[model samples]
Target: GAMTIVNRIRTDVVNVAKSFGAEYSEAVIDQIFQGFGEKFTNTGFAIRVQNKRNQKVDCNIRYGEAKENCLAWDIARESGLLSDQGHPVDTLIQEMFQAIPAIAYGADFDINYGLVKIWHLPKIVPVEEAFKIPSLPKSVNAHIDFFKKYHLDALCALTVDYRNKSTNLYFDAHHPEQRTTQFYKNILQSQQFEVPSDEVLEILVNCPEIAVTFNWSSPGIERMCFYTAFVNRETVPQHINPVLKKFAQEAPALLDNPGFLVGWSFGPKGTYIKIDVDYHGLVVPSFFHMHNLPLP
Candidate 1:
């Protein structure tokens, strides 16, 4: 069953990668499938498509590969996907691994563009301490204090957006469920971004993980990301808006699927929605159909 699932995901990834001119070895996808799957029971790989006209697709593939043998990094480097990058990205990754115990590595692909680097950290006592992670931007530092003040445990993951040259911090929405709403308000205020409609916040509070991003070239927060664990397709419509619900209902079902990590991003520029189809479920084709993206 694992092999069957891996094969399906591989075929879909390979097809879409080729279409986007992203050079990838089919063998590497096999490695990627096992890299995260073997280590974590949760869905290891997910592909995201934005709620935009151009339909920029993002693949968030989680891996437990040794840092020395990072397949995605190597593949992207060899394919010239990470060619334009400089020391900042390298320094950030190094600092994270050195400062905290990295649980895993993640690589995100912009199907129409290139690769983005990401890493995850576990929730532990040392991570919550006041020690600052050197070279971190001020907004990030402020966010750390904000989390510390409220006793919120969002010290989970960090992502490097090479294209935008931005840094993002991921937080977990835990403990008492009611605090989730206030958490959203605090983040919005901290980021100095506008809050979405009450109806939207009603849905966002129910979502679990949150990512507050800061631009590398600028001063303030870039986007506030909220994630919802959308597992059962039957109930998907009730949780999402009418526009998104139509697409949610059409996605093909799977065997005990992990469903989707639905991303809702609110920022100064605008608000956007992205859906990451789980490794156990359909990949790009199904994702395209769900988002009404025309196949290339």
Candidate 2:
């Protein structure tokens, strides 16, 4: 089983380059895995490519328009990395990883924290869509989020406690804040919003504990990890989530919008955010499983 992975990576490196209209050999991909029953990214690989010439390479083959799927292709292309070029071929039959940012745990793993979900908001007015800055994160193939910055209508998040049966919703009444760093700061300054269920936001605004989070991840180029914020720089203990406390026998059945996300946006109700982290400022958090949100 181990060799099965190593072998596919070796072949895919060259094959993917070909599919992307590029060519290479002995793809010099690196290693960054945390073994089974660890956290996120169960059994992944670092597939790379070598020009066979002077190494003019850009790899990590994937498809689909979702952030977790094709976002990597968009960034690498604009950032001087190209794919599906040497000769056009159907993306199908190509074994590329899809980009899906989620944090869920049901295995005996010790800690758990995230997942992918979206809310459906009834048409209110103007229909301000939740627009994402595809160029923002792509600008820096190797960078961080909210680097001395911030964008448009974005989604808000709401956390549900399985035990309390009470939802914790909170939003800072304060605006034009002064805190955090880089991309984190930019997000606040942008004054962006996304379309979401009015019912969700109203309830969230009234609660004192409406939750908010800041997350940043990489494509496993030079490395792989995440820099995230939950209730300030300190991670809001995973135990606060009832699901993690008792540990579900398996990933919970999706509750309409995957549960826990309550952001207002213009995009569809459940559009997951796809961040092209311009830089890296963190990785592990000691309390949750962190996996590479790979380019594929």
Candidate 3:
């Protein structure tokens, strides 16, 4: 079933790239897809299409890694999105590897976006021990405390965004006991972000897991996203389409699907949706059918 998804993405990459004005050839994307299929155990494609004409669509890959995601560094550098030395991203990777013994790793990669983010899912270490990681600011202690206050699970994924030169701490909010609409509302309010409408929150309640991203480089929380098993949820909430329509007039046409995993993200930036595609891989499909293009 997983290889089925990989083969489908290989063909769709070209179409998605073209829509964003990035000219990646079929052969190039094929090789990139092959690299991922061989190195990473599981993969999901996350899309972010812009409402503006000039802004590039973010056809990002989320990979599940077992080797501390070291192989990912090679793939990104081989693809020319990341380099070996003298780059901020390279330096960040080196430092992180040296400091923390991560439990597991994951990543977000976008060829057109030309940025690489390394996700370090640490073993629930003490807050004081978190300071050992050179890049983290002193303020993260409180952020960690806030996460524990809600009875949320303890582990946090420290993401180093190389292209944007940003850092974020992603706290998991998927505890079975904490997976409620009221919990979501309370957490968002505590983070000082605008709590999404109850209609959206209802959809999130069905989500298997919800995670919030706190921008370590900024003064406040940044994003809250929902995730669901694709096979179970075929269509997104009707309310989500209307919100996207106000920004991207083409939202309705693109978001309709037969079998997919759809989720929403709310923040000060804007409301956005990311859909996961599952194809049998008998034939290659157009990018429009495969990519998850959400408004920013």
| Candidate lDDT (C-alpha), each | 0.55, 0.23, 0.51
Q: Output the better candidate (2/3) by TM-score.
A: 3
Deviation of model 2 at 213, angstroms: 23
Ranking by TM-score: 1, 3, 2
Whose lDDT is higher: candidate 2's or candidate 3's?
Answer: 3
Which one is best on lDDT?
A: 1
All candidates: TM-score: 0.69, 0.19, 0.66
Task: Show model 1 residue runs off by greater than 4 Å.
Answer: 1-43, 52-71, 125-132, 175-182, 251-258, 281-296
Candidate 2, residues 1-296, lDDT tens digits: the string is 44543344344444444543443323122221112211112221122221222333333321111122333323333433233332211131121121112122111110111111111111111102111212112223222232222221122212222211222112222123322233232332232433324432322232211123222232211111112222221122223333222211111211211111112212112122111111011111211122112211
Per residue, candidate 1 scores C-alpha lDDT tens digits across 188-222 of 77657677676667768765466777765666667
Candidate 3: where is the Cα deviation over 4 Å? 1-8, 16-57, 83-90, 122-129, 174-177, 207-210, 214-217, 233-239, 242-263, 278-296
Worst 10 residues of 3 by lDDT: 281-290
